[PDB]
Each structure stands twice: as structure tokens, then as C-alpha cells.
């Protein structure tokens, strides 16, 4: 991936779709295991796995910014809101980040969820445990 494509274009979306379709579905069994404040090392470690899985270069930095509650939408952003929405998160469609207890929740696979639950291009959620493939 060269990343040399306009954000939000058809040519970028086509590359995203190809990538997302190469990922393995995930089922998240422990929402309470979420790591909402990953430190710099953890973000960088996830970044490498994304890049190795073929993630479009034009979006990888944005997904990584969106791995931490400081850049999560309103339905994920606070301790309180995460308690409120714990069950509702089961509605997300998630793909596994290879070799990691982490998932991508891509906006293109989650149009059913509010803009308060996902924004373009997607979000990353990291967990201590509970992430399973199906």
C-alpha cells in the first residue's frame, strides 16, 4: 500500500474493502476487558500488526489514533458511557487484528451503528482477553 489516494474516494474505499475482506471475523466475549488508554508502546505494536495485515496506508494512522478513548466517539469515550453501552457493543461487526487481542470496527461494516458509536474510517479496540475468531 502506497497510501497515495484521496481520503473518502471510491479508489480508497475499494482498497479498504479488499483489506477488510482479508481479515478474520471476531467475536468479543469480554467487553469488560477493554484497554481504553493504551500507552505509546501498545499503540505502536498494534500499528505494526495493521501494517503487516495489509492495512491501507492512508488510514492506518487514523485507526491507531482511534485506539484510545481520547479519540473515541461519544458512545465509547467515558467510563460511564462504556458501562451504559456494554451490551449494545455486541452489535458491532469486528475483524480480528492478527496475533493480537484487538479488533478493528470499520465504519463501512458498521453503518447500522450510530455516528456516536463509530466514525470514519473506523476504531480499534484492544482487550486484555476474550477476543475470539469465528
UniProtKB/Swiss-Prot annotation:
Interacts with USP8, ERBB3, PRKN and BIRC6. Interacts with CSF2RB, EPOR, IL3RA, MYD88 and TBK1. Interacts with CLEC16A. Detected in ovary, testis and prostate. This is E3 ubiquitin-protein ligase NRDP1. Acts as E3 ubiquitin-protein ligase and regulates the degradation of target proteins. Polyubiquitinates MYD88. Negatively regulates MYD88-dependent production of pro-inflammatory cytokines. Can promote TRIF-dependent production of type I interferon and inhibits infection with vesicular stomatitis virus. Promotes also activation of TBK1 and IRF3. Involved in the ubiquitination of erythropoietin (EPO) and interleukin-3 (IL-3) receptors. Coiled coil: none annotated. It comes from Homo sapiens (Human). Disulfide bonds: none annotated. It comes from the Eukaryota. Autoubiquitinated. Autoubiquitination leads to proteasomal degradation. Deubiquitinated by USP8 to get stabilized which induces apoptosis.
